[PDB]
Design a protein around this ligand. Structure first.
Ligand SMILES: [Mg+2]
Ligand SMILES: [Mg+2]
Ligand SMILES: [Mg+2]
Ligand SMILES: [Mg+2]
Ligand SMILES: [Mg+2]
Ligand SMILES: [Mg+2]
Ligand SMILES: [Mg+2]
Ligand SMILES: [Mg+2]
Ligand SMILES: [Mg+2]
Ligand SMILES: [Mg+2]
Ligand SMILES: [Mg+2]
Ligand SMILES: [Mg+2]
Ligand SMILES: [Mg+2]
Ligand SMILES: [Mg+2]
Ligand SMILES: [Mg+2]
Ligand SMILES: [Mg+2]
Ligand SMILES: [Mg+2]
Ligand SMILES: [Mg+2]
Ligand SMILES: [Mg+2]
Ligand SMILES: [Mg+2]
Ligand SMILES: [Mg+2]
Ligand SMILES: [Mg+2]
Ligand SMILES: [Mg+2]
Ligand SMILES: [Mg+2]
Ligand SMILES: [Mg+2]
Ligand SMILES: [Mg+2]
Ligand SMILES: [Mg+2]
Ligand SMILES: [Mg+2]
Ligand SMILES: [Mg+2]
Ligand SMILES: [Mg+2]
Ligand SMILES: [Mg+2]
Ligand SMILES: [Mg+2]
Ligand SMILES: [Mg+2]
Ligand SMILES: [Mg+2]
Ligand SMILES: [Mg+2]
Ligand SMILES: [Mg+2]
Ligand SMILES: [Mg+2]
Ligand SMILES: [Mg+2]
Ligand SMILES: [Mg+2]
Ligand SMILES: [Mg+2]
Ligand SMILES: [Mg+2]
Ligand SMILES: [Mg+2]
Ligand SMILES: [Mg+2]
Ligand SMILES: [Mg+2]
Ligand SMILES: [Mg+2]
Ligand SMILES: [Mg+2]
Ligand SMILES: [Mg+2]
Ligand SMILES: [Mg+2]
Ligand SMILES: [Mg+2]
Ligand SMILES: [Mg+2]
Ligand SMILES: [Mg+2]
Ligand SMILES: [Mg+2]
Ligand SMILES: [Mg+2]
Ligand SMILES: [Mg+2]
Ligand SMILES: [Mg+2]
Ligand SMILES: [Mg+2]
Ligand SMILES: [Mg+2]
Ligand SMILES: [Mg+2]
Ligand SMILES: [Mg+2]
Ligand SMILES: [Mg+2]
Ligand SMILES: [Mg+2]
Ligand SMILES: [Mg+2]
Lengths: 155, 117, 101, 138, 59, 113
RNA sequence: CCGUGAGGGAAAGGUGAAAAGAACCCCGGGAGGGGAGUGAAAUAGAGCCUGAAACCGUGGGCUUACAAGCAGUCACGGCCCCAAGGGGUUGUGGCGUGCCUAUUGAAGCAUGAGCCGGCGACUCACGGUCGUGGGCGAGCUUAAGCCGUUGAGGCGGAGG
RNA sequence: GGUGGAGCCUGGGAGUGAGGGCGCGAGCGAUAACGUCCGCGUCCGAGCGCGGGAACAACCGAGACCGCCAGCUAAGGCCCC
RNA sequence: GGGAUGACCCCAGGCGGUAGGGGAGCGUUCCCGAUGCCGAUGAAGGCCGACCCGCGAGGGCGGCUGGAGGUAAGGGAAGUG
């Protein structure tokens, strides 16, 4: 600000018989080296959104997917080992051919690893379900041991 | 996010200059002296567009008053004769008859002095 | 021929063939005849009558390619701390070709 | 919008024999003649109309008593002098000018007014050594 | 700082009109009747000078 | 074809060179070089150097035949102003400006006879 | 750099892909050019990308040396550009007391402004008071903290 | 009677609290001031934006959404400007 | 009010404005949209435009200049004019 800058506090003109404008320090914000007037100060932007609004959001975020037809509930991932070979061979027989992006919600980290690294999968933990990561993808595929934690998480 | 002015102030000042190509000095080379004569220039555009409609009245009245004196009466008798004939002709934009094709006006003076003579 | 026509509130002198901006009418398409009010005859042997009330018994025929052109306007007032720049009036014209009397 | 304009018509070299007329009462005929306020071609920015030649000056009669009453002050010289000229002196020496000063107030003030004053050729008459050309409008 | 000072900036018009008569006059040159170089007049310029003139380097 | 000449940063204030280059704008070469040989200004040295250099760049580069050429266009421009200080009374220290110039005399042929 | 001193305290980035940063001429004392050459580009040629504006020039069109004006605008007319209609000029006419601030009032002979380019002034933290979009609704509701991430969020009812 | 950017109420946001001319009623002043202080207005303020008043905030005419090379008019004029 | 909604369609009025109050918008920087779509078959920028759309703020298109970034519709936060 005007006060925080590393200038001085000396009145740079004696204000009366100079003829130029009356000015305080160079650190005044109208000077070109000066501070800024109202520039941003580092603040936390996060706020408590109500927990019922978060739960209703994560309900309607998957309700949109089920209302379209872009929801899938697999349990047995045939792709063990986290090989993206195994995951893409799984997706070919599953019905996620790759042109439409998918949120992948699995409690199996060795398929989160497989789908971590594609241009069309947002991998996700079963607890880290959230409406922004739901909506930014066009499909949703989740495990039975992620749908169970989601169903008992929301009302 | 610091939003520099940058491109916006030049795009405004070149707009004022492109609107003001033509005036005298710094009046049309100065992007803060050309607002001061685009304000007054647009104000004169307003007042003179509303003044053109009466300028041309005070031109056509002269053309009728000079063409009806050629036929031997004055304009103040002429329009009284026209409005007692009952018309919406000659309608001073049509003080063209009195200039060119003058026999139409030479019969309109007859229909004037007849209707008020 | 010679003719004088009131249409759209103003009065124009018209020949066999000419017309320009005519203060846009309520006749939409291109190939559209139109019956305006003749005023004073036209100085041939057959005609030449200045007509009371504009009640000339014959009309004209006015086909037209109607369309507003945008006009270089910037119709701005200014008093002061006041800048009402924002009125530009392209002022919808209508483009007549007239046929006869 | 229509087109109205005149063109450069050959002028009207009107003579005005001014043996009887009072100036002013004459001169507003002359100024209305000088501008084209009598022909119906009149655009106000062309100085069309007449090249009036008013002749037969002094014995321009004037109204009731203006024998040393009408003061032609016009010439501020420039330090102490508004120098006054009555009409007796004006008609005595270069008469020639009471009409010029009568029409130079009834013409307008711009360059068209100044061009229009050069059309008016006042003489002390008759035999204005100027003419063979006289629609002598009276 | 003091008493006589310009009230206004002389614009391009009055400045470039006051710089009218400061156009330089071209010098006068005459062709030296011995050989054709352009001396100014009444001037023993570096050719010969006048007839039998005072020499730079010549016979 | 018109041979360019430009002598840049020639260090003479440009109004004072404009006053001599106006004298040679439009003149023939054998006329103009000996105008400059006796024109009593400082400009008439730098413009003389650039006129001789322009004639040489018309001959030895664009083969433009030294006799049949004149000065087509000729103009100087302000260059980077060397801003020195000239100290005054009461410590006022005004900024004297040694302006520099960019001189141009393009030279073209008149017509081949 | 200023200051004895404590102290104040600047400005100043960008060639190009690569220096291939211009061999050799020619003018010039040299600087600087013009060729040649480099390179895709050299009005990218060295404190060099883009390089605006103020400003300063040169060339062309129109225009002015009997004119009067807050510099314009409207109207016609003349003339070169495009050929329907335009823009550029401005000759004449008509009409016209600058901008901002402060004002009972400003063209004001009240104030500020040389011009241009940038920087430049209603925000934010926590509370409060009304509104509105929502959620829940005689219920509502988290805080710090805890646990977990990838720019996943839940648990936490102390309290209000 | 009066449907009008009329009213009444609640709540939010104000601005403003240096006014001025004119008319009328008065005070102070001198039956002075473009004086000052009120009351009823009005107008400028913010409508000088326009017309007339030669020019001119408040005098007379009139409340400017924009356009038109149409018309009728108010105060004011009609010899010319 | 007309509406066999598509509330576009007309109708009666209104529409000077300072302090102000209120409502619509256009822009600049950044972000989500974006691991996307444009872009050397020339980005941002600069100069123009007599064209186009918008009442305007501005936005498009075209021409050169530029030689490498730009970022849609809808939204969000401002060091926003
Ligand atoms: Mg400090
Ligand atoms: Mg310090
Ligand atoms: Mg201190
Ligand atoms: Mg000063
Ligand atoms: Mg600094
Ligand atoms: Mg800083
Ligand atoms: Mg600095
Ligand atoms: Mg993946
Ligand atoms: Mg800023
Ligand atoms: Mg009217
Ligand atoms: Mg169109
Ligand atoms: Mg003649
Ligand atoms: Mg003759
Ligand atoms: Mg003194
Ligand atoms: Mg100057
Ligand atoms: Mg000169
Ligand atoms: Mg000294
Ligand atoms: Mg020291
Ligand atoms: Mg590189
Ligand atoms: Mg060299
Ligand atoms: Mg440079
Ligand atoms: Mg550069
Ligand atoms: Mg020129
Ligand atoms: Mg004269
Ligand atoms: Mg002349
Ligand atoms: Mg005047
Ligand atoms: Mg004028
Ligand atoms: Mg006036
Ligand atoms: Mg004013
Ligand atoms: Mg006030
Ligand atoms: Mg005061
Ligand atoms: Mg002032
Ligand atoms: Mg003054
Ligand atoms: Mg003062
Ligand atoms: Mg003050
Ligand atoms: Mg609720
Ligand atoms: Mg834990
Ligand atoms: Mg108080
Ligand atoms: Mg008070
Ligand atoms: Mg009051
Ligand atoms: Mg008072
Ligand atoms: Mg009052
Ligand atoms: Mg009293
Ligand atoms: Mg009084
Ligand atoms: Mg007082
Ligand atoms: Mg009031
Ligand atoms: Mg009012
Ligand atoms: Mg008035
Ligand atoms: Mg008046
Ligand atoms: Mg109104
Ligand atoms: Mg009428
Ligand atoms: Mg009337
Ligand atoms: Mg009356
Ligand atoms: Mg309003
Ligand atoms: Mg942006
Ligand atoms: Mg592409
Ligand atoms: Mg950007
Ligand atoms: Mg571009
Ligand atoms: Mg373009
Ligand atoms: Mg966008
Ligand atoms: Mg800012
Ligand atoms: Mg700011």
């Amino acid at each position: 600000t005007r006060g925080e800058v590393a200038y001085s506090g000396r009145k740079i003109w004696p204000q009366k018989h100079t003829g130029r404008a009356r000015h305080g320090d160079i650190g005044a914000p109208i000077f070109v080296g000066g501070g800024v007037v109202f520039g941003p100060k580092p603040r936390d932007y996060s706020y408590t959104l109500p927990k019922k609004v978060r739960k209703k959001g994560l309900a309607m975020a998957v309700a949109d997917r089920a209302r379209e037809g872009k929801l899938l509930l697999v349990e047995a991932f045939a792709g063990v080992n986290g090989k993206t070979k195994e995951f893409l061979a799984w997706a070919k027989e599953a019905g996620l051919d790759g042109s439409e992006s998918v949120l992948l919600v699995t409690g199996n980290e060795l398929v989160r690893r497989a789908a971590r690294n594609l241009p069309w999968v947002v991998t996700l933990a079963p607890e880290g379900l959230n409406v922004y990561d739901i909506v930014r993808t066009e499909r949703l595929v989740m495990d039975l041991d992620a749908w169970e934690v989601f169903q008992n998480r929301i009302g | 996010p610091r939003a520099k002015t940058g491109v916006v102030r030049r795009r405004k000042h070149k707009k004022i200059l492109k609107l003001a190509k033509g005036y005298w000095g710094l009046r049309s080379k100065s992007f803060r002296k050309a607002r001061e004569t685009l304000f007054a220039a647009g104000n004169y555009a307003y007042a003179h567009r509303k003044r053109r409609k009466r300028d041309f009245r005070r031109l056509w009245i002269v053309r009728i008053n000079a063409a009806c004196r050629q036929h031997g009466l004055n304009y103040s008798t002429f329009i009284h004769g026209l409005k007692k004939a009952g018309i919406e002709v000659d309608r001073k934009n049509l003080a063209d008859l009195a200039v060119r094709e003058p026999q139409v006006f030479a019969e309109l003076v007859e229909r004037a002095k007849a209707a008020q003579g | 021929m010679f003719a004088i026509v009131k249409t759209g509130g103003k009065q124009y002198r018209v020949e066999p063939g000419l017309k320009l901006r005519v203060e846009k009418l309520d006749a939409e398409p291109g190939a559209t005849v139109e019956l305006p009010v003749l005023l004073l005859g036209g100085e041939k042997t057959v005609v030449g009558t200045p007509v009371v009330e504009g009640a000339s018994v014959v009309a004209e025929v006015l086909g037209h390619g109607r369309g507003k052109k945008i006009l270089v306007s910037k119709f701005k007032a200014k008093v002061q701390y006041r800048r009402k720049k924002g009125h530009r009036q392209p002022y919808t014209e209508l483009l007549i070709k007239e046929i006869r009397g | 919008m229509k087109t109205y304009v005149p063109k450069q018509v050959e002028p009207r070299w009107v003579l005005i024999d001014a043996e009887g007329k009072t100036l002013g009462r004459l001169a507003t005929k002359i100024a209305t003649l000088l501008r084209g306020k009598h022909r119906p071609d009149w655009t106000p920015n062309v100085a069309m109309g007449d090249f009036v030649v008013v002749v037969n000056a002094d014995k321009i009669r004037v109204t009731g008593k203006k024998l040393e009453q009408k003061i032609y002050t016009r010439y501020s010289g420039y330090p102490g002098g508004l120098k006054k000229i009555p009409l007796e002196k004006m008609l005595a020496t270069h008469p020639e000018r009471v009409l010029e000063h009568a029409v130079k107030g009834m013409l307008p003030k711009g360059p068209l007014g100044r061009r229009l004053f050069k059309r008016l050729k006042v003489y002390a008459g008759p035999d204005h050594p100027h003419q063979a050309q006289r629609p002598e409008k009276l | 700082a003091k008493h006589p000072v310009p009230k206004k900036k002389t614009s391009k018009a009055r400045r470039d009109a006051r710089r009218s008569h400061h156009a330089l006059t071209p010098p006068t040159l005459v062709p030296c009747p011995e050989c054709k170089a352009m001396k100014p007049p009444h001037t023993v310029c570096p050719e010969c000078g006048y007839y039998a003139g005072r020499k730079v380097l010549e016979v | 074809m018109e041979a360019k000449a430009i002598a840049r940063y020639v260090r003479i204030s440009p109004r004072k060179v404009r006053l001599v280059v106006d004298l040679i704008r439009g003149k023939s070469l054998e006329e103009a070089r000996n105008i400059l040989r006796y024109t009593n200004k400082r400009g008439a040295y730098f413009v003389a150097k650039v006129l001789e250099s322009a004639a040489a760049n018309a001959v030895n580069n664009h083969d433009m035949l030294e006799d049949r050429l004149y000065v087509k266009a000729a103009y100087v421009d302000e260059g980077p102003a060397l801003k020195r200080v000239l100290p005054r009374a009461r410590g006022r220290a005004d900024i004297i400006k040694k302006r520099t110039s960019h001189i141009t005399v393009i030279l073209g042929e008149k017509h081949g006879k």
